[PDB]
Write an enzyme that holds these catalytic residues in place. Structure first.
Site, PDB file in Angstrom:
ATOM      1  N   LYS A 145       0.828  -1.211   0.000  1.00 23.52           N
ATOM      2  CA  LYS A 145       0.000   0.000   0.000  1.00 23.52           C
ATOM      3  C   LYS A 145       0.872   1.275   0.000  1.00 23.52           C
ATOM      4  O   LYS A 145       0.783   2.143   0.865  1.00 23.52           O
ATOM      5  CB  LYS A 145      -1.007  -0.110   1.143  1.00 23.52           C
ATOM      6  CG  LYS A 145      -1.951  -1.275   0.852  1.00 23.52           C
ATOM      7  CD  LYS A 145      -2.833  -1.823   1.992  1.00 23.52           C
ATOM      8  CE  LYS A 145      -3.349  -3.182   1.477  1.00 23.52           C
ATOM      9  NZ  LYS A 145      -4.300  -3.892   2.281  1.00 23.52           N
TER      10      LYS A 145
HETATM   11  C1  LIG Z   1      -5.483  -4.257   2.840  1.00 26.71           C
HETATM   12  C2  LIG Z   1      -6.491  -3.339   2.522  1.00 26.71           C
HETATM   13  C3  LIG Z   1      -7.753  -3.567   3.044  1.00 26.71           C
HETATM   14  O1  LIG Z   1      -8.684  -2.789   2.738  1.00 26.71           O
HETATM   15  N1  LIG Z   1      -7.942  -4.649   3.836  1.00 26.71           N
HETATM   16  C4  LIG Z   1      -6.931  -5.523   4.097  1.00 26.71           C
HETATM   17  O2  LIG Z   1      -7.164  -6.489   4.860  1.00 26.71           O
HETATM   18  N2  LIG Z   1      -5.694  -5.335   3.609  1.00 26.71           N
HETATM   19  C5  LIG Z   1      -4.595  -6.299   3.855  1.00 26.71           C
HETATM   20  O3  LIG Z   1      -5.135  -7.502   3.294  1.00 26.71           O
HETATM   21  C6  LIG Z   1      -4.854  -8.656   4.094  1.00 26.71           C
HETATM   22  C7  LIG Z   1      -6.115  -9.307   4.694  1.00 26.71           C
HETATM   23  O4  LIG Z   1      -5.756 -10.564   5.269  1.00 26.71           O
HETATM   24  P1  LIG Z   1      -6.690 -11.414   6.269  1.00 26.71           P
HETATM   25  O5  LIG Z   1      -7.660 -10.512   6.998  1.00 26.71           O
HETATM   26  O6  LIG Z   1      -7.419 -12.331   5.328  1.00 26.71           O
HETATM   27  O7  LIG Z   1      -5.678 -12.107   7.132  1.00 26.71           O
HETATM   28  C8  LIG Z   1      -3.864  -8.163   5.146  1.00 26.71           C
HETATM   29  O8  LIG Z   1      -2.583  -8.289   4.481  1.00 26.71           O
HETATM   30  C9  LIG Z   1      -4.184  -6.680   5.277  1.00 26.71           C
HETATM   31  O9  LIG Z   1      -3.023  -5.899   5.602  1.00 26.71           O
END
Ligand SMILES: *c1cc(=O)[nH]c(=O)n1[C@@H]1O[C@H](COP(=O)(O)O)[C@@H](O)[C@H]1O
Ligand SMILES: *c1cc(=O)[nH]c(=O)n1[C@@H]1O[C@H](COP(=O)(O)O)[C@@H](O)[C@H]1O
Lengths: 329, 322
Positions: A145
């Protein structure tokens, strides 16, 4: 008519994988300290059966960093290489998750923040993870990001796309869309790269700026999506088999519907299923595209924190495909 | 132990400036330092090796203490690490007496893989031993569970005083960056309000809520979070990144948030105007207006003189403002 692996743009690589494997599961690999510790404890208790399995895989011989260490006998590491023990079990955890789940995965996404908090060590692990996935030919996203001015973001471009050899990354364009010219394009080498920009995020207060801010009667997330696509057009990414897609959270059902309706052929990355409790039926129906590489469903902790990650990944793969079948009827 | 707010005030009393020196070394800076050192009998490395606090760095100290003639023959795989770390030490040694704070942008330390992260660690160790306040510039943003890893890297592993954060994803991320509930620890951050890049108006100005531009909405939400977290009572704060080239915004921000901490990049390499920036962003506790200069010092072949001149002119301008 045949292209060798590594010698094609992300758009083509994603399309081929989806045709082969028939899913849009993106498996997230975000190993926390508890995960690594738990893996080490479990391996110690069962004479390292998973590590011995990793050691059998041929592509482990093709990773860049401290192969000498990674290929050692586990009991030798613990007794004779104590300063390398964390490196070893950390890297073997990731290889294990990849070996167990890769047959179900359209793509793997690795979030940078999980690989940095111990210093240089996790970045060696991360490099090896990207090398290993490159050898297996599985599409990759580095979730970082990133945002900054153009002169500074060139550095991330080099780390992500030259050093890691990632196929894509995630980017926050709040600072300005012009940063994309230094991320998705390398003017020196004349190379193009793909990225997903943040549009609607899964955090519980994401609405505070993405929906409350507007221009005339378009909410910020809509304006940001349009701007990103305008930049993709200017850069001619799709002509070079690359793209700029959209991060839209798996709990933002109205926004998913809007983005898909108003940008019919956009590539969407959707985190939030599993640990964050998003509704998979709603998300996948609202984001559906018949080229379903255009709707990547990322699942991280719900696979990686399960004691049987192969079966957890199979279950999500099967559940996604069942919903895909309904959308295709 | 003490708190960034108190650290800044106390360093300000000792050195009387608000210069923030940006340490952002690119590959060409490193290669040039290595080329020049060779040609001038490693005069700068040999000066570095004379300094006390090099004996306190965490990572590969053994190597950093070796003579450069021997590194190149017998530790060749460490040559880049050696010269990269020595470039950073050279800049700090030459300029630290003029700096209220040092800011290191993470992006410059990552693109060679792990080796630059070891340099970054030693850099933070060295500054810590010199008791210079530090800022890690990383413009971080993620969901709460993820950003906790950045809190650990930045505030536990590097022991940085502060960082930069982008709160466009939401303001609640700050609860997992500036606060550690488990440990009862509080940390400081600067959030992006108005950035220096040429097209920064697209989202920061052209988007609005009520009758306020986006940048104002963002600054207010960040201060509300500061209040929620009780940062100022723990001698920590949430401050603002406001571009040196953004005079109206600077003006607005200083007028409407009178006692806010501002970090202002964009003078030197990006052409901002020092006199206008400092006048528009002025506060008598001038640690509340950090003027960041990176490339205009680090890409100057005479970096000590370059820092001195910014220090001097900042001080002449501060004197003028009273
Ligand atoms: C990034 C942006 C967003 O809007 N939501 C997010 O969860 N993320 C990143 O995606 C991953 C989600 O992983 P999980 O909840 O399935 O373990 C995580 O890398 C978060 O930083
Ligand atoms: C961050 C935000 C911003 O709005 N403008 C910026 O320039 N930055 C970062 O600050 C540093 C500027 O350094 P220099 O132009 O004096 O060399 C740099 O780290 C950039 O990432």
């Amino acid at each position: 008519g045949l292209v060798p692996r590594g010698s094609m743009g992300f758009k083509v690589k994603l399309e081929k994988r989806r045709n082969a494997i028939n899913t849009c599961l993106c498996i997230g690999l975000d190993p926390d300290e508890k995960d690594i510790e738990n893996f080490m404890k479990n391996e110690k208790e069962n004479n390292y059966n998973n590590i011995k399995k990793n050691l059998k895989e041929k592509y482990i011989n093709n990773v860049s960093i401290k192969k000498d260490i990674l290929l050692k006998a586990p009991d030798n590491i613990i007794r004779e290489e104590k300063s390398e023990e964390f490196f070893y079990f950390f890297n073997h955890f990731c290889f294990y998750i990849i070996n167990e789940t890769n047959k179900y995965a359209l793509t793997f996404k690795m979030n940078f923040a999980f690989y940095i908090p111990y210093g240089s060590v996790g970045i060696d692990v991360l490099k090896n993870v990207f090398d290993y996935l490159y050898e297996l030919n599985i599409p990759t996203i580095l979730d970082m990001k990133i945002n900054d001015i153009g002169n500074t973001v060139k550095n991330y471009r080099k780390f992500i796309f030259e050093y890691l050899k990632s196929d894509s990354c995630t980017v926050n364009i709040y600072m300005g869309t012009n940063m994309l010219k230094d991320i998705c394009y390398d003017e020196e080498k004349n190379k193009y790269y793909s990225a997903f920009v943040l549009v609607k995020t899964t955090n519980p207060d994401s609405a505070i700026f993405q929906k409350n801010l507007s221009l005339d009667n378009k909410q910020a997330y809509v304006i940001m999506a349009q701007e990103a696509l305008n930049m993709s057009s200017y850069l001619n990414l799709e002509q070079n088999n690359e793209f700029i897609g959209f991060v839209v959270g798996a709990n933002s059902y109205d926004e998913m519907n809007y983005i898909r309706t108003y940008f019919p052929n956009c590539y969407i990355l959707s985190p939030g299923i599993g640990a964050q409790n998003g509704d998979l039926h709603k998300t996948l129906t609202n984001g559906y595209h018949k080229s379903y590489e255009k709707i990547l469903i990322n699942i991280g902790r719900a696979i990686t924190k399960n004691p049987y990650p192969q079966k957890a990944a199979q279950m999500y793969y099967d559940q996604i495909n069942a919903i895909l079948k309904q959308n295709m009827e």
